[PDB]
Design a protein around this ligand. Sequence first.
Ligand SMILES: N[C@@H](CCCC[NH3+])C(=O)O
Ligand SMILES: N[C@@H](CCCC[NH3+])C(=O)O
Ligand SMILES: [Mg+2]
Ligand SMILES: [Mg+2]
Ligand SMILES: [Mg+2]
Ligand SMILES: [Mg+2]
Ligand SMILES: [Mg+2]
Ligand SMILES: [Mg+2]
Ligand SMILES: [Mg+2]
Lengths: 295, 296
Amino acid sequence: NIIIGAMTALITPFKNGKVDEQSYARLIKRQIENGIDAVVPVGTTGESATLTHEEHRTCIEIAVETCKGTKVKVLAGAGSNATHQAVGLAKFAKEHGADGILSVAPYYNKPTQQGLYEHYKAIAQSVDIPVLLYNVPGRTGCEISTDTIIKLFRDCENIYGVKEASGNIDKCVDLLAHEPRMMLISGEDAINYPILSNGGKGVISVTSNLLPDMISALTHFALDENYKEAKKINDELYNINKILFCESNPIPIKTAMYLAGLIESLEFRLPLCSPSKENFAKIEEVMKKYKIKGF
Amino acid sequence: KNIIIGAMTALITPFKNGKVDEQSYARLIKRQIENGIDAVVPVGTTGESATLTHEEHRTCIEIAVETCKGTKVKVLAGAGSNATHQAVGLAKFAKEHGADGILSVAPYYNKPTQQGLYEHYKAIAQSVDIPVLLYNVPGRTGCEISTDTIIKLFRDCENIYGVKEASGNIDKCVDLLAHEPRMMLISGEDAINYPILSNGGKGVISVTSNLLPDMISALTHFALDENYKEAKKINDELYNINKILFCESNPIPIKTAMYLAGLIESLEFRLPLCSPSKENFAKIEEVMKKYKIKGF
Ligand SMILES: N[C@@H](CCCC[NH3+])C(=O)O
Ligand SMILES: N[C@@H](CCCC[NH3+])C(=O)O
Ligand SMILES: [Mg+2]
Ligand SMILES: [Mg+2]
Ligand SMILES: [Mg+2]
Ligand SMILES: [Mg+2]
Ligand SMILES: [Mg+2]
Ligand SMILES: [Mg+2]
Ligand SMILES: [Mg+2]
């Protein structure tokens, strides 16, 4: 009971300071039509931190409704640094038809490994849908160790793998060498192919917001062990993959989506804001080397 | 600028049966007042700000204000958020409910740029007319307020008067006060309270003072009075407890020590925080034995 394949950490478009729900649905339809296997509403890339709890819930509902009647799954963002709120989001996602949840390691409060284990156990015990852990220490200030990930995978029936955003291919080897049944998911676009070629089973991508067909193809080639073709795409995408992090994600990806005419306004919620003019121009220049699908 | 400086405590938040123990909270604050503390910080990191509800966060600020009323002790209310709209809401609440100023941690998790940090804190500072202390703790937030950004905020915004630094970076503390000597640099790292004060820092926002308020207030007051020999003496004596209070993530050790000292009833955290390991529980207990812990 897993959610794998090519997946997108959806941006959240704003219009006049509110979630633009029509644009959100339209962007999801564009992901579906370009080979994406699942969408992740309200992850880091979707500005989870600055949505209200009601908006967070609305974006999950829009993703569920938009994916009905399709093969595309909804892996709902449900993380929180307070376990009671992470349980509440997990339950909401279950009750409102998500296929599974993503759940980021608690940020700012730096729980111990024992606390992370208890956090995730509480979340997994609250629902009967798949739970994907999400490790991104550069943002949270903590790491879910390999031992803790493996213990959670083995001890909790619905915890099925981890999204790694840690720049640590050693850890990816460690994870799958000791627990080959888990689903390791790339959370770092530039190294999608290395993670997949070591037996990772999907990506939760920032770049796919802009280039969903390319990330889709990369992932599906790799899962088929067509590594030459997957690597070729990974290699081709390196420049855009890296420029999308020239400032904190999702500042560059929303900039690119705006430059591509895919969102109406380059609008963030504070404390996120527009990139520098110089970075804005760098992103624009890198984009010229890629074919960007429209609607 | 109006300022809040001196010896300050990042209050722990005691829980009882899963709720804030409001009587214990007030009792702990009165104990801080009686041991020379200059201000208290309700609902900082040490107060488990992340896992209190917005209502509990507000109640703890109100208890601090009421308990300090009529004493000279100030309330520098924890008001940070990684969402600017919520940081503004907490700032306004603290202003409207009688806090003397606010602490406001740099946004965690979403990694704003320096421009975003500037706009975040400008919005906060413009929303109130009480002092605002920035708070940099990159190991927990994932971002750093640069020296340049702190100094610009200090110069551009009337209310922003300094920063609590929890960054292990005495070079930055020199940089800050060499280029902007008018700001109030506040130590947010107990083990290096004395180095920060001796370079012209003007107070501490302390974890250790929860347990040893008299020692931390004395350390700070000796230093402000330029008795560096005596401030260093206490800083040195406190190193072992200062370090053991971070053997696991703060506030796990300090709540453990407060419980071991009989100062709180229950060793209760909100998940994802939890009890320390049995080894670290014993280590904290052992280190505490070398210090004289004031009662109530
Ligand atoms: N700003 C808070 C609340 C987010 C609520 C919706 N995801 C946080 O980052 O945890
Ligand atoms: N857990 C959320 C909400 C805290 C609300 C009370 N301080 C955060 O850390 O931002
Ligand atoms: Mg809205
Ligand atoms: Mg999440
Ligand atoms: Mg790490
Ligand atoms: Mg890397
Ligand atoms: Mg095939
Ligand atoms: Mg091949
Ligand atoms: Mg704060």
